[PDB]
């Protein structure tokens, strides 16, 4: 909600308070998305002030509070900054912001992570250029300079973050992406390299000294009708966990397909229905095996802009003699947001 | 305070910064409250939308920031999420609401938690339906559906959390309160009996399989005057600790009683006279022990609406012989608010 | 921002979003202030309430939250309230606050804490009085009781702080500073001493059973030009580490020098010149030793008062000999600021 706005300077500070919980049978540990109360908020700003005509200065933080914690000594689980980044955009020349903020790739993945509460499987977190991560410099172009209506790209360059787990570490990377929107259509292709650090290195699974993630996207979005693909393949990116041996490391190969079709009725109801599969090649040992492999209904209905409810059904593919140990049974998730 | 109010959506940002010290001689861990800087912080936010004339959505999320820690690895020590919902009201239909909220038997309890600093020693965090706890769905009925005025009932279903505690974990159960409030007065009668968890199980103190907590309340509210009483039960549900063996669990049975008594003169002083006793019956090995026994003796003076301080003086009633080890030491405290 | 302000109320809601990088050689192990990644954002709120003509009350809390850290189990690195405080300001008889605030010494080495990144070396946190700690209450005067204009004074009691460290404990003290303030011109003098818990004695480093720190400040600040200089020194209360042997404790006695000069060009570029040096005297085992010695060269360019740019180059001047192992590479900072 804008809750300042003068000299220039507009603050809008945000947040949203989720009841939620799924439904999954068994102790969830073998579902799709476990089981249980999973109630959350979020708190948030969206700065930004005009320095002149042209040029704009802007900055962004969000946090997640998890709310199915106790007052004790789990509190804190769950609990992160999701984004925090600061920028200036100049006239046609583009933007430039630095920080905690979305790796290129995703400007692809977006496309398909739509669904009321799961989907956007591929996208992970503090996984190079996929999802969130840490120090990365993002410079952003639109409608070529001004000259070209409809094309924008991007080039980011990710900063190596050597931490103390080889699945939230990286080396040095870039990533770019490029997409064109003519008319309800849209289309992008989003590519990046990074180094992978000693400690990913030294992992059990995976093999390379490079991380590679390329996904393309196709969307169609007007008339009230919202469709959208992406298929993209990564090397050595994407973690990966045996549970029988207890063993990780990234998927040497996956490739990766999302759909989803979905339509807003004039009323408020927002049905949903999807498709996710990814696939590991080569993995150490297995050979090929799915990591995600669903059919996914759901409906949303929003009351207004500030409140909704939701049912998210995860129809699992995945079957039971899936050689990581990846989870088979259902999971459906209902919730109930406030937000403003 | 109100910082947004259009398009139906008013949002109201609060919290407020307590400077607080506990006075109890020795190292405080014989007194009641302990002793030193116990400075916090509170930051929240309580939305409301209305959806049309009938309907209306709502979202809560609070947060507590202790401030007696230092920027060190003890940071973060006592920070948490202490109330996270989001709910519809219908009319007269009633409101449901969902996430980390109060449990129904507080609605019991909630008469004598009044005093400045201390009080409500019964109404503990994560334990079932007295205080605060995760995963709840609440139905609340006011006016009986508008045909009886001053007749309001809740039903509260509480799903299982399995914590990694046994203090902080709970299985399923359904609780209840009716309360009536004519003019000044008002009573009320809340119930909840749940299911205890394998680990609450293989406790040292407790023997059950069912946890179950009742407490009524009376209450006069007017003309300056406020006193109220409460007396409630339990079984197997309220956590205790052997200081001298280090064992742990809950009593096998509680009778709690408590008494209060203010006056708000209208210049600002709220004295206060309070009497907390709880005695916990069975306990495998002691017998009887009491848990809390003091009179309380305290006043609060309020500046304005968003400033005030008080004292809160505690004069424990708990004998040096006592069989748990519970601390028998007075304490005071004092305290400095600032809110919005 | 004031995003609030009606009768008699008035909250002002500030953050900022810092999107930051430091640039050392090797692993930033050996340099002045690291290498990486450093972006952080705060949040925090100044209340303030007019109980009437002569009397104020008034809060503030402000948070840290790290943007360098992942969404895994490292995401609360860092992560600290600040400050937690409230209070009363009356007439001209002076103002009383409590709660985690600024060590009254800090009134004197506030003096030369501008640097654009670095800078205030000797201003540490949980360190008595000198930097931000817990339960203190503090009195301040201006204007001599409204008698003498420019003269101020303030006094502080510490209380103790036995925490499970002896870098971040304390025992209880009292401190004081006076400052007077004429026409552009400022200068001040602040002590303050206190007890040393009995862990921060049982350390290897550090002799004695009181901990003192006193500072002087000269400052001339108006025409755009901002000159400063500060000379303090101290008594087992620096907390110093032999990096060789991993030892450590508190300095017996050092001496510090800071001096900065600075100018605010009327288009918003504010260059930087500085000079810091702090050396340990007496410290068991290795004699004189640096701790602190660098000449710093940067600048800020203000695109207006919420947007923000700065490089800070500090010229490390400790030597690669230095016997407790304080690195003696140099550190560029580059950052943009968004904030409200
Ligand atoms: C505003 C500071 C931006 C700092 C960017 C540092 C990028 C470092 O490595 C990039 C490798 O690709
Ligand atoms: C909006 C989602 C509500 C989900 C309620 C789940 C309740 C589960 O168990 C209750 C047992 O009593
Ligand atoms: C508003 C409460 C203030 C409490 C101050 C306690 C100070 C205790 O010790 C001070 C030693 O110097």
Redesign the interface.
């Known amino acids: ?1 804008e ?2 706005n003068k ?3 507009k ?1 809008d ?1 945000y ?7 799924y439904f999954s049978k068994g102790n969830g540990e073998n579902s799709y998305g476990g089981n ?2 999973m ?3 979020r ?1 948030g ?1 969206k ?1 930004e ?1 005009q ?1 002149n005509s042209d ?1 704009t ?5 969000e ?14 689980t769950g ?4 984004l ?5 955009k100049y006239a046609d020349v583009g933007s430039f ?4 903020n979305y790796g290129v790739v995703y400007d692809a993945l977006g496309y398909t992570d739509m669904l009321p509460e799961f989907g956007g499987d591929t996208a992970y ?2 996984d190079f250029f996929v999802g ?1 991560v ?2 990365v410099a993002t410079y952003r172009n639109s409608n070529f300079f001004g000259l070209v209506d409809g094309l924008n790209f991007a080039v980011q360059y990710l ?3 050597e ?3 080889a ?2 570490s990286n080396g040095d990377g870039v990533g770019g992406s490029i997409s064109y929107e003519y008319e309800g259509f849209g289309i992008v292709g989003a590519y990046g390299a990074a180094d992978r650090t000693n400690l990913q290195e030294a992992q059990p699974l995976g093999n390379g000294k490079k991380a590679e993630q390329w996904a393309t996207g196709l969307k169609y979005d007007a008339n009230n009708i919202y469709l959208a693909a992406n298929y993209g393949e990564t090397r050595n990116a994407t973690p990966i966990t045996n549970k029988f041996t207890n063993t990780s490391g990234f998927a040497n190969k996956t490739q990766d397909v999302l759909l989803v079709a979905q339509y807003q009725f004039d009323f408020g109801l927002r049905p949903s229905i999807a498709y996710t599969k990814s696939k590991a090649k080569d993995v150490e040992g297995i050979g090929d095996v799915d990591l995600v492999n669903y059919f996914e209904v759901g409906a949303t209905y929003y ?5 909704s409810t939701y049912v998210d059904y995860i129809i699992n593919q995945i079957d039971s003699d899936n050689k990581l140990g990846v989870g088979s049974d259902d999971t459906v998730a209902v919730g ?5």
């Open positions: 909600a809750i300042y000299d220039g300077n603050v500070l947040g949203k308070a989720v009841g939620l919980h249980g109360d109630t959350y908020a708190l700003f700065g002030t320095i040029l200065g802007y900055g962004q933080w946090y997640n509070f998890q709310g199915n914690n106790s007052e004790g000594a789990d509190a804190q609990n992160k900054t999701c925090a980044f600061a920028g200036l912001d630095y920080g905690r977190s503090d969130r840490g120090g900063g190596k973050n931490r103390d787990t699945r939230r009351f207004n802009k500030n409140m109930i947001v406030y937000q403003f």
